[PDB]
Amino acid sequence: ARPCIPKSFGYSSVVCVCNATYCDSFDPPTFPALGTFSRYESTRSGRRMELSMGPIQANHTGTGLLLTLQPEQKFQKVKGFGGAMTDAAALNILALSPPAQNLLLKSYFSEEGIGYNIIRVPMASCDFSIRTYTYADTPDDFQLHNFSLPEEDTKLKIPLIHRALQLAQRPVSLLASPWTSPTWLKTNGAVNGKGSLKGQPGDIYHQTWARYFVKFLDAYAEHKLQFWAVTAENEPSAGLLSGYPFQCLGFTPEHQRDFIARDLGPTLANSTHHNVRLLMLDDQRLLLPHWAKVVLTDPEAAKYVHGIAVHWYLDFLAPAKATLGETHRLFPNTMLFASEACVGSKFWEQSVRLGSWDRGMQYSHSIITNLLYHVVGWTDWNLALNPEGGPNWVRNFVDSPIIVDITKDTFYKQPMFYHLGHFSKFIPEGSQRVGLVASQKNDLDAVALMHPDGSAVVVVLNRSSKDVPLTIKDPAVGFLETISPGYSIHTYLWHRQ
Amino acid sequence: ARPCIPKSFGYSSVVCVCNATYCDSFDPPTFPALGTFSRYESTRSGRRMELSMGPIQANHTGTGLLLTLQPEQKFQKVKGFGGAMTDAAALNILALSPPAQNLLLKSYFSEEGIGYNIIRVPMASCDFSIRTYTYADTPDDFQLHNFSLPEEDTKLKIPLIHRALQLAQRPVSLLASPWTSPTWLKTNGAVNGKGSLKGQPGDIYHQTWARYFVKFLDAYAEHKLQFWAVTAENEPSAGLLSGYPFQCLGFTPEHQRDFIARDLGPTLANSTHHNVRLLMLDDQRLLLPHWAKVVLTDPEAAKYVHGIAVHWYLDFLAPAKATLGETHRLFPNTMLFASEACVGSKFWEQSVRLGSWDRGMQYSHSIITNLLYHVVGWTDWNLALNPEGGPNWVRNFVDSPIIVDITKDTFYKQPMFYHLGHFSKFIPEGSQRVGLVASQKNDLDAVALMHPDGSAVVVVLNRSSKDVPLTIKDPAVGFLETISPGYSIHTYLWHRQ
Amino acid sequence: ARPCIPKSFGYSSVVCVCNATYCDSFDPPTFPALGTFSRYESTRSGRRMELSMGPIQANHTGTGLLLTLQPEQKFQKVKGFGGAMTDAAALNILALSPPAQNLLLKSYFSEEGIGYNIIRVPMASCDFSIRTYTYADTPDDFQLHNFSLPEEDTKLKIPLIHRALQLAQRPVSLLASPWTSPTWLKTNGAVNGKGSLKGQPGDIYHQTWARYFVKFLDAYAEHKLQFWAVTAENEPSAGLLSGYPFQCLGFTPEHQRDFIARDLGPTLANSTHHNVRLLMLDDQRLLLPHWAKVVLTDPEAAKYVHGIAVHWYLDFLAPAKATLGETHRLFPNTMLFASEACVGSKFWEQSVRLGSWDRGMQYSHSIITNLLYHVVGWTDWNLALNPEGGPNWVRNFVDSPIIVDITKDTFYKQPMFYHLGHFSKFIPEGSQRVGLVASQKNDLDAVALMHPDGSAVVVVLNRSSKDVPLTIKDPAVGFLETISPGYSIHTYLWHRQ
Amino acid sequence: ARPCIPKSFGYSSVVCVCNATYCDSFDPPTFPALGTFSRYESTRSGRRMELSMGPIQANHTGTGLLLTLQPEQKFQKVKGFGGAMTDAAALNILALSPPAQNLLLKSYFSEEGIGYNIIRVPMASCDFSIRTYTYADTPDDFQLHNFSLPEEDTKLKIPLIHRALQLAQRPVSLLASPWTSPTWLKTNGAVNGKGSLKGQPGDIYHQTWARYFVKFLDAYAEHKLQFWAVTAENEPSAGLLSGYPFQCLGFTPEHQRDFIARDLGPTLANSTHHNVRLLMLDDQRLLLPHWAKVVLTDPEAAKYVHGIAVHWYLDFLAPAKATLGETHRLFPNTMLFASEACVGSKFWEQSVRLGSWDRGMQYSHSIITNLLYHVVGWTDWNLALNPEGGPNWVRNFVDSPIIVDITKDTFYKQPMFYHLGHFSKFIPEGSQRVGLVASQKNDLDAVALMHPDGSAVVVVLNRSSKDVPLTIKDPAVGFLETISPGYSIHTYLWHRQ
Numbered sequence A, B, C, D: 001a002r003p004c005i006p007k008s009f010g011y012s013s014v015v016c017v018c019n020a021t022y023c024d025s026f027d028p029p030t031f032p033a034l035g036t037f038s039r040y041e042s043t044r045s046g047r048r049m050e051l052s053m054g055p056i057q058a059n060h061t062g063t064g065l066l067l068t069l070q071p072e073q074k075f076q077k078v079k080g081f082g083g084a085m086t087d088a089a090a091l092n093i094l095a096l097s098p099p100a101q102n103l104l105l106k107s108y109f110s111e112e113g114i115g116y117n118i119i120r121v122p123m124a125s126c127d128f129s130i131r132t133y134t135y136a137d138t139p140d141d142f143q144l145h146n147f148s149l150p151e152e153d154t155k156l157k158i159p160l161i162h163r164a165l166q167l168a169q170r171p172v173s174l175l176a177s178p179w180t181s182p183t184w185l186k187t188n189g190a191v192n193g194k195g196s197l198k199g200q201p202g203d204i205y206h207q208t209w210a211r212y213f214v215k216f217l218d219a220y221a222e223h224k225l226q227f228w229a230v231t232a233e234n235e236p237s238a239g240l241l242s243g244y245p246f247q248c249l250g251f252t253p254e255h256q257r258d259f260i261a262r263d264l265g266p267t268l269a270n271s272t273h274h275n276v277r278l279l280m281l282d283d284q285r286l287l288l289p290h291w292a293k294v295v296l297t298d299p300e301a302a303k304y305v306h307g308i309a310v311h312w313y314l315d316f317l318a319p320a321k322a323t324l325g326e327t328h329r330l331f332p333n334t335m336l337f338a339s340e341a342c343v344g345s346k347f348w349e350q351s352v353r354l355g356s357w358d359r360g361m362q363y364s365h366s367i368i369t370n371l372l373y374h375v376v377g378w379t380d381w382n383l384a385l386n387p388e389g390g391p392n393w394v395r396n397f398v399d400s401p402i403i404v405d406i407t408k409d410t411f412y413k414q415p416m417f418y419h420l421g422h423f424s425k426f427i428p429e430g431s432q433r434v435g436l437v438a439s440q441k442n443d444l445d446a447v448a449l450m451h452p453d454g455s456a457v458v459v460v461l462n463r464s465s466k467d468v469p470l471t472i473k474d475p476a477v478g479f480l481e482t483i484s485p486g487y488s489i490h491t492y493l494w495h496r497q
Ligand SMILES: *[C@@H]1O[C@H](CO)[C@@H](O)[C@H](O)[C@H]1NC(C)=O
Pocket: A005, A018, A019, A020, A021, A022
């Protein structure tokens, strides 16, 4: 419906510029007529999820690369894609004028945008907040009588989640994660630094912390929001480190295991929120498979754990078979779910590199690796940041796919936004990853899935500077003859019957 | 009645620790017979507004510096002393338990505290707000039917003010200042950045803005609050600087003049709040004499201006004589008032330094200089901040006399608080600055005033490391022999008959 | 002449991109024919010192703004224009490939560039150094036996200065300033923080320090480099402030006075380098006229002082007449010289803002202001910086007219470069400022000078958005009919016979 | 012989203060009769390589953890331990007065110190250099006639290396790594950033690069220095990261393979320095086993490779078993060597922390892990750094075992330094690692080795806060009853015959 307005800031590619009256969008989604394929294309030269259609042909000859769909090699089913409603993201989007906010929420949540169906909601404050608070800052308040949501929740976060869900046709899943407990529950009595819960699992500190999860859920339910899942703690391993600079709460894998079996599991079960799922870990994938073994080989903790949540800082490089693979082999029936990714910890590069196609490729390459290793969903960090990559109370800034320029009442959709959307738009909940065999080694990243309805979706990333001719075989329909240009990403869609 | 409990944070002096059940306080004011003085003393070494008495004797044993009171040499009368009830300050005070809230408010407003009689109230949001916002965010409501107070006003600020004035013996004067207008009244359509009101004084926008002041004053009146005065805009020169980060609204001196002439003055006059004073500038003193010349050398703007509000922030750029001194000479009948009497801090320093005696010595030095250059009143910035100098939705650069640690239900009284109190507690409204002649060049800062009742008040600041032997002469009573210790501030008080 | 290659980075204007093979340049300078004027134009829209020529008319009618030259009202003679060869500057330039370096040095020092004839040299380390050092770091070395220049001088700074002088057709004048003494000459024993020279003027500390100036001079002399002037100390006021974060040495005006009278004056006088001039102050003009009074009303110190060096941080708009004016009036025979200026506090935006036209206008506006107040010279801070605005060992980054991108082997010439060039290219040493009378009130900044050969030069800056038609009147020749477009800068040059 | 002089800087432990006349040292090694052990102990509490002796008894009086020496399971033989003589380290050493220089050099290199036997020597500049430079910076010297060593080599590094080897008992092995080639060999003509060599293995550029290694070695031989080994490139994977800030030269594993195969190997073989060993990777352990699989499964490449060099950056991203363990299995005859066995510093901590015991433990823990995974040698990063972690021409990022204060002619020996000496002092070249079996799960890190003379060394690290009672059995001699105190590291030494 509306094309990208490109703007350069001197990096490898362009941003798309949005304001109160204009934002790039899509027409309502239609399926390609049987015997044809749809293609979406984003490129470094500046194409943005641009649509074409082509023929599915009956024959193929040649010694070029062929990707062959294996429709009966069925893997993980998809939960979905989204990002986080942090204090910072909330503050930024509401600093835009009301029509700009709506254009921004449409970009992510609407069918005319990229169909996000996950929103991660911090339980009180994190580094991406402009102050440090909890829901229970009255010292020693074991009954949680002074539990309340600050304006950050009731003025900024909640209203925006309501608006986001309104704009979405897909059911949206809310995920919650706490960074810290009240300081009076903690051995070190602070929001940061080294420290865990006081006492032993089973006891008043552990029981009050469990109950705070339930109060959180109650108070969001008062505002007509329900959660799909909660995590046991954001980055439990961070509060094990002396001088950790922002909000944290340390657990060893053993302490997490015991908290869940002794406190958190039974407490959620006994509540009216018992259908909310629980996810362990919520941390670096390098901590796998050990964390999962400690927790899940204890049937008392296992009964209560729906899934394993993993983080990744994309500026680094951890292998995936060692961690996601082994974890899946050890516990095939416990879902693997990526709850946070970000880039921009890059030290020679600033926090926000406006228009960076490299950071775009980092994202889609990470999504593909995750889908290739059983991961069922993928969640970005902050939904929106400023040109500095904040606000952040500890100046630990990072990139975000949307950047808000408040003085200009404009936002910028970076290549990260489009590289995310090549998945989120075309891979609905229930999509099932299926096999796809390459006929010769190549430099391309590829993944195939089938929608609930039975149709095919393939994403292909080209992180090289050379164009790659390739054909995709679907034995039900024929061949799609295409080229993957260097520095492009494609989504291919077709009906199979 | 209760002494300071000292705590060191590794800076040059101490804070006084207060909590829900304890805070340092004063006995009611009780002053002695003719021929005796009262001294209140604060030292870097740890004394905090400590009281003693001594004689005023017929003969002179001092051979060093002599300050002679000259009651017949009469200057300006004093409006008073206070600070700002910003969203930040209100949120911080209200994060304490009720009894703690009361000790903090008594610390400022009661006679058992330091006797504040002025409160500055922002009109909607500033940087010291957790969110951007105005009282009229619905676009094109030129009649402001949609005008209202959010929760920041009706929940935080308004009851805290009601409680401030219950606690106070002296009448409290309220002062309002806007930071930004609704953004649909603005050129740049943004809450911050370079931009002014749309079009020309007299037009549809300039008139709606003027009516906004009336709507603000009305809304506070429904809540039983009356204002002493308003500023025409907070820091109007700021919103002429491209992408200024905070809520701003740009006026040139000429634009301010015409808005007052054509719109603000005429509208306020035609209202039921015609008694509310109008203050121009509200900005760095470096902009004087010029700003005053532009606005006040126009009879139709000048007839509407009671005063000139000034900020201390950038005092070091332009000196007192050339700015305040010169302005008074040209416009001797328009009062000078320090409306945002606040600090720096320093590029290489933290916003909040707990126990910084320097930051205190800066406060008193600056109040003295002001007093010596015709200034009638002083309004500090935020009443309280958190230990990070927040919350500020942009970035915190400033300290505050009271720092709240919400996690501990404790608040800290900085040296700045006592430095302020050496003036505010003992210079009531209507006190007149009188002469005080040094006999020889010296390093003290000193100022003398006479209370409405005729009794003498003298402040001696020793910003140096060395004890200074001092005599104070009153022609009518005799000689007060004393010592001004290095890094001390003293207030002397005595009956004159 | 090779024209500018424009690039945007999202700011108000473009930069000019240079590399190993291409840099925008000028043709050799030509006098315009008698009866015609030369114009050089730079605009926000993207013109960079474009040459045009027009006619000098015999008469004029209007109404319009008329700037009238007063050839016989003669003011200050110009010393010149240039910038600082810091460690940061030099490390950056030498990180370019040999051919790129030369294009950068040509830009500044060549007649085919912008004609710089000042280079300010730090005497050892400053904040724009990647380590701290002095030339005499052996403790208690009073004889200065281990005085030596490091590679920072011998490998980076010196060879670049040689190459700059080689490229220049004009005589270049070198100006040296120290930030710190050896730590064993200081009271606090550190390169930074609050502290002065130990002992009293006249003693071994003060003598050794004076002899260090001579040793510096000797060492630069062995490398065939001769100095025009030395400052008594960079920002003497800075060493008076506890916690001052980088290299400093504190002098009160009195200590500076006496150091000069007792030590630095006689020592330089007794040396072979007695022809090198001594400039006092080297700090902000807010310190004036007081510093000058204190130093210069002492004939023992006055006899040794050739000039007053002044700094301005351009983000702090503060006047002007009260400092530079009052100073010239008191000491008409002691030149004022601007020895350092920089932009980039704007805490709302970066150190570096690639393509900022605003920062360009701050430079030229400050040069006009200076020139209209008797100032004979203007020196920029760092010649070149990286995109972060360093390196700087204390992260005190600022903007620079040339920015080096080392990974690209490219340098960007910001609008600050050209805004400076409108002066340095066209006002040689010896030029005399003359009168220029505006016929009516106007928003333009303007300044007229006469070249040593009798020809005129006028710079006109338009900082408003509106085009201003205007005529320049010279009695010798007639009228120049022209327009000043909004956000533009022009230099006009004509022969007067 | 001389004890540690301790100084605290507010971190968890102390540094040992050394100056021109005083440094801690050891007595000449002296080992007791069969049945007696020697123990060196360092504690966070303050003990530094403190010596005591004790018996090896017939009866077992302990009932806790038992460690049994298994001299018959024999593993890798040890090459040695050392650090890098960077420009920065040479800087930093040479700013000290000669006597102080020598005490620093004995600290590392003599038997009265910690007996270093490896130095890593960068080939031209790296980040720890005060300028960028290579040895052939004049373009189109394809035959390298203008190849020369600058002053950093001939003035700083080489004389220091000479002096190190005079001081050393043991033969010292020199290891050379290039960071960057001449820029006119690089795709990008920049010293840093994304860029590899130009063209293809075999061509003019690759042949010149390879001859550069021979000219480098040639030049060092005229200075009477010869090398043990070179690495093919320092950190090749970083030259693939866009805008990489440090000196670099990108190689994919396939490219390194081909450059070793076609150029580097053949060229070194044909030369007079054919006995110089060649190590591959020189990069993070996460890159393994893959990197190794690419280069070593090609007999044209592998006939030319002696070892695999790894960095400890970046170790947290990958575990030992999966990388080092798995690489040993696949290629059991290619030795693993830690070439840059250094930090790195947590995003929120300073580069240098004086007295950080935790950083010390990080070192010894990591040397232990390495030894338990077949690693034969170590090179720490910079030998010395200034208290800022410099000079680094890009960014001060890491700590160094010795920190040098040039202002005070004093140097500080950090905990890291004694943790290193617990190994380097007592593990001579040719020591072979042996079995050391734990009787039960425990928390100590322990490794046993056999000297070339068949005597025993065991290092025990206790990273916990609690004392652990410990017995060590040697089947041949008996039982050593001991305690590993919390936060301690022990070295045990005994004859077995
Ligand atoms: C925003 O939208 C489009 C951008 O292409 C443009 O035509 C319009 O001028 C812009 N509007 C504002 C309010 O800046």
